[PDB]
Amino acid sequence: SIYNYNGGCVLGMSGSNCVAIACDLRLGANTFTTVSTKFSKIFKMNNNVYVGLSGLATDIQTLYEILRYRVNLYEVRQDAEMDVECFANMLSSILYSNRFSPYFVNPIVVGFKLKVNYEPYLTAYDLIGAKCETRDFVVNGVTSEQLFGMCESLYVKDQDENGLFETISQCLLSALDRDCISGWGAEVLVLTPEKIIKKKLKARMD
Amino acid sequence: YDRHLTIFSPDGNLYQIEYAIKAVKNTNITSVGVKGENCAVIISQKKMATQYISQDKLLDYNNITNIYNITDEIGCSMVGMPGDCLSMVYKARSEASEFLYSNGYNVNAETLCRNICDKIQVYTQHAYMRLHACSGMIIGIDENNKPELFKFDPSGFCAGYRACVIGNKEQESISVLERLLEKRKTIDEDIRNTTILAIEALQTILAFDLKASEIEVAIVSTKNRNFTQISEKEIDNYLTYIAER
Amino acid sequence: MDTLIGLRGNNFVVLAADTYSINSIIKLKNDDNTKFYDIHGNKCLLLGGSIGDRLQFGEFIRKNVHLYQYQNNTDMFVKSFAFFTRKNLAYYLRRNPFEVNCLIAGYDKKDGYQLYWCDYLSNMDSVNKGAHGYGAYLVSAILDKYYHENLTVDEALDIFKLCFEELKKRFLLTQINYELRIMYDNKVETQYVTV
Amino acid sequence: TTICGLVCQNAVILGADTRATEGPIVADKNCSKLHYISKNIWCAGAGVAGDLEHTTLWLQHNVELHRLNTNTQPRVSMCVSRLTQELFKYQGYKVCAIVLGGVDVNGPQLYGIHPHGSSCLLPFTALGSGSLNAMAVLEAKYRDNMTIEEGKNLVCEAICAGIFNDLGSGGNVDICVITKDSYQHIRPYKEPPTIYPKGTTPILSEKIEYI
Amino acid sequence: MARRYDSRTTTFSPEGRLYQVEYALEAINNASITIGLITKDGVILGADKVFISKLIDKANNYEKIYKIDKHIFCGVAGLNADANILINQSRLYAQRYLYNYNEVQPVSQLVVQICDIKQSYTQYGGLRPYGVSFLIGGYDTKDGYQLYHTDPSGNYSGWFATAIGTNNLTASSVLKQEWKNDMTLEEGLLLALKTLAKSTDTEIPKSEKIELAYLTNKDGEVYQKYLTEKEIEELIKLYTQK
Amino acid sequence: GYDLSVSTFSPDGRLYQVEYIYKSINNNNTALCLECKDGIICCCINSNMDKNKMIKKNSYNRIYHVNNNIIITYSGFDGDARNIIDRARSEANTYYYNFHTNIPLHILVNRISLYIHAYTLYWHMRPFAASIIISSFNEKDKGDIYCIEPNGACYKYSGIVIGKNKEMFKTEIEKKDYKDINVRDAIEDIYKFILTSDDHMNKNNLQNLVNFSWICKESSYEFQNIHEEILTPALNKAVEYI
Amino acid sequence: TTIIGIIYDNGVMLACDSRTSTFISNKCSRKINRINENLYVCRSGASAHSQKIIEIIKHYCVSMKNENRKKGRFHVTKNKYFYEDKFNDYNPLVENVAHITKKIIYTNNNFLSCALIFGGYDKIKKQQLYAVNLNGSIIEKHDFAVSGSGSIYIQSYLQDKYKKFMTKKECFNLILNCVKYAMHNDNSSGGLIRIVNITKSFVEEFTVVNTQMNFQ
Amino acid sequence: YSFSLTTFSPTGKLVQIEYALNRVSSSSPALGIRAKNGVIIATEKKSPNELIEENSIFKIQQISEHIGIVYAGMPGDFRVLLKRARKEAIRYSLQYGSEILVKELVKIIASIVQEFTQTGGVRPFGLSLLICGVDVYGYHLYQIDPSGCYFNWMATCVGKDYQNNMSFLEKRYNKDIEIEDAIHTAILTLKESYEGVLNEKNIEIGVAKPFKILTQNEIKDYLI
Amino acid sequence: RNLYDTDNIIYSPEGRLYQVEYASEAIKQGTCAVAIKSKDYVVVSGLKKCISKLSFPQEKIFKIDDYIGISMSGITSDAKVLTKFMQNECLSHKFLYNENINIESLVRSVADKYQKNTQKSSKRAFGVGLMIAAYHNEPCIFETRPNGSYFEYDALSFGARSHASKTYLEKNLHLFEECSLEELILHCLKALKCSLELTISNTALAVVGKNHPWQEISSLQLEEYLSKVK
Which residues are CB-neighbours of G2 under 8 A, at least 6 positions away?
Answer: G15, G16, G17, G146, G148, G149, G150, G151, G154, G178, G179, G182, G183, G186, G189
Q: How many domains does chain G have?
A: 1
Taking phi over 0 as left and psi of -120 to 50 as alpha, with beta for the rest, E137 belongs to: beta
The chains in contact with chain B, meaning 3 or more Cβ pairs closer than 8 Å, are D, E, F, G, H
In sequence order, what DSSP letters do the residues of chain A get, joined into one string?
A: -TTTTT--EEEEEEETTEEEEEEE--EEETTTEEEES----EEEEETTEEEE--B-HHHHHHHHHHHHHHHHHHHHHHTSPPPHHHHHHHHHHHHHHTTTS---B--EEEEEEE---EEEEEEEE-TT--EEEESSEEEEETTHHHHHHHHHHH--TT--HHHHHHHHHHHHHHHHTT-TTS-SSEEEEEEETTEEEEEEE-----
Return the H-helix or E-strand segment holding D121: strand D119-122
C and B: touch, per 3+ CB pairs < 8 A? no
- Active-site residues of G: which are they? 1
φ and ψ at residue D205, rounded to 5 degrees: -155, 155
Q: Whose CA is closest to E34, among E160, E147, E171?
A: E171
Cα–Cα distance between D14 and D3 in angstroms, integer?
8
**The length of chain E, given as a count of residues:** 242
Tell me the domains of chain A and their CATH numbers: 8-202 (3.60.20.10)
Which residues are CB-neighbours of C189 under 8 A, at least 6 positions away?
Answer: C181, C182, C183
I1-230 belongs to which homologous superfamily?
Aminohydrolase, N-terminal nucleophile (Ntn) domain (3.60.20.10)
CB contact at 8 A, B23 and B175: no
Inter-chain touch A57–C86, beta carbons under 8 Å: no
CB contact at 8 A, G143 and G162: yes
**D70 CB near a chain G CB, below 8 Å?**
no
For chain I, domain boundaries: 1-230
Vertex C99 angle, CA C97 and C105, to 5°: 110
Vertex F229 angle, CA F228 and F234, to 5°: 90
CB contact at 8 A, F60 and F50: no
Q: How many domains does chain H have?
A: 1
Q: Give the resolution to one decimal, in Å.
A: 2.3
**D201 CB near a chain H CB, below 8 Å?**
no
Residues of G in contact with B93 (CB under 8 A): 63, 66-67
CB atoms < 10 A from the CB of H159, how many? 24
Side-chain half-sphere CA neighbours of E25 within 13 A = 13
Contact residues, D window 77-136, toward B, CB-based 8 Å cutoff: 77-78, 80-82, 85, 105
Residue H196: DSSP 8-state: S
Inter-chain touch I112–F83, beta carbons under 8 Å: yes
Cα–Cα distance between B109 and B140 in angstroms, integer?
5
Residues of C in contact with A65 (CB under 8 A): 87
CB contact at 8 A, F29 and F43: no
Interaxial angle between packed helices G47-67 and G94-107, expressed in degrees from 0 to 180 and rounded to the nearest 10: 130
Contact residues, I window 3-22, toward E, CB-based 8 Å cutoff: 6-7, 9-10
Cα–Cα distance between I127 and I113 in angstroms, integer?
13
Distances in whole angstroms, Cα of residue F159 to Cα of each of B214, F34, F156, F167, F170: 21, 4, 9, 13, 8
The chains in contact with chain I, meaning 3 or more Cβ pairs closer than 8 Å, are E, F
Distance from CA of G170 to the nearest CA of D (A): 33
Beta bridge partner(s), residue B152:
B136
Beta bridge partner(s), residue I65:
I68
Cα–Cα distance between G128 and G125 in angstroms, integer?
7
G and H: touch, per 3+ CB pairs < 8 A? no
Cα–Cα distance between H204 and H185 in angstroms, integer?
14
Handedness of CA D125, D130, D136, D138 (dihedral sign): negative
Inter-chain touch G71–B63, beta carbons under 8 Å: yes
CB contact at 8 A, A137 and A14: yes
Inter-chain touch A132–D27, beta carbons under 8 Å: yes
CB contact at 8 A, I149 and F78: yes
CATH class of B1-243: alpha beta
Q: How many CB pairs under 8 A join B and F?
A: 115
Which residues are CB-neighbours of I175 under 8 A, at least 6 positions away?
Answer: I183, I187
Residue C120: DSSP 8-state: T
Distance from CA of H11 to the nearest CA of E (A): 6
Return the H-helix or E-strand segment holding H71: strand H67-73
Cα–Cα distance between I23 and I124 in angstroms, integer?
8
Instruction: Map residue B208 onto helix, strand or coil.
Output: coil
Taking phi over 0 as left and psi of -120 to 50 as alpha, with beta for the rest, F133 belongs to: beta
Distance from CA of H107 to the nearest CA of E (A): 8
Cα–Cα distance between E136 and E68 in angstroms, integer?
9
F1-238 maps to which CATH number?
A: 3.60.20.10
Q: How many CB pairs under 8 A join C and E?
A: 18
Q: Whose CA is closest to B84, among B20, B137, B158, B171?
A: B20
Nearest-by-CA chain E residue for F4: E1
Instruction: Map residue E95 onto helix, strand or coil.
Output: helix
Contact residues, G window 60-89, toward D, CB-based 8 Å cutoff: none
For chain C, domain boundaries: 2-195
C2-195 belongs to which homologous superfamily?
Aminohydrolase, N-terminal nucleophile (Ntn) domain (3.60.20.10)
Tell me the domains of chain D and their CATH numbers: 2-186 (3.60.20.10)
Handedness of CA E152, E157, E160, E161 (dihedral sign): negative
Instruction: Map residue G210 onto helix, strand or coil.
Output: coil
Beta bridge partner(s), residue G204:
G80, G197
For chain F, domain boundaries: 1-238
Residues of B in contact with D180 (CB under 8 A): none
Handedness of CA C12, C18, C23, C29 (dihedral sign): positive
**E3 CB near a chain F CB, below 8 Å?**
no
**The length of chain F, given as a count of residues:** 242
Cα–Cα distance between G179 and A202 in angstroms, integer?
77
Distances in whole angstroms, Cα of residue F171 to Cα of each of B49, B58, E102, F187, F200: 22, 11, 87, 17, 19
Pairing of strands F154-157, F142-148: antiparallel
Inter-chain touch A57–C94, beta carbons under 8 Å: no
For chain B, domain boundaries: 1-243
Q: Which of C72, C74, C83 sits opposite E102 (nearest CB)?
A: C83
Distance from CA of B21 to the nearest CA of D (A): 27
Q: Which of G23, G48, G55 sits opposite D116 (nearest CB)?
A: G48
State CA H31 to chain mean position distance.
7
Cα–Cα distance between H185 and F56 in angstroms, integer?
88
Cα–Cα distance between F30 and E224 in angstroms, integer?
82
Q: How was this structure determined?
A: cryo-EM
F and B: touch, per 3+ CB pairs < 8 A? yes
CB contact at 8 A, H38 and H168: no
State the residue range of the domain holding G196: 1-212
The chains in contact with chain A, meaning 3 or more Cβ pairs closer than 8 Å, are C, D, E, H
State CA C47 to chain mean position distance.
6
Cα–Cα distance between B244 and B236 in angstroms, integer?
13
CB contact at 8 A, G194 and G32: yes
Instruction: Map residue I122 onto helix, strand or coil.
Output: coil
State the residue range of the domain holding H60: 5-224
The chains in contact with chain E, meaning 3 or more Cβ pairs closer than 8 Å, are A, B, C, F, H, I
**C101 CB near a chain A CB, below 8 Å?**
no
Return the H-helix or E-strand segment holding B88: helix B82-103
Residue type, D11: A
Which residues are CB-neighbours of E75 under 8 A, at least 6 positions away?
Answer: E34, E35, E36, E45, E46, E47, E64, E65, E66, E134, E135, E137, E164
Residues of C in contact with A27 (CB under 8 A): 123, 125
Cα–Cα distance between B92 and D62 in angstroms, integer?
23
Residues of F in contact with E2 (CB under 8 A): 123-124
To the query of whether residue D56 is one of the catalytic residues in this protein, the response is no
Q: How many CB pairs under 8 A join E and F?
A: 5
Distances in whole angstroms, Cα of residue G176 to Cα of each of G24, G171, G211: 22, 8, 11
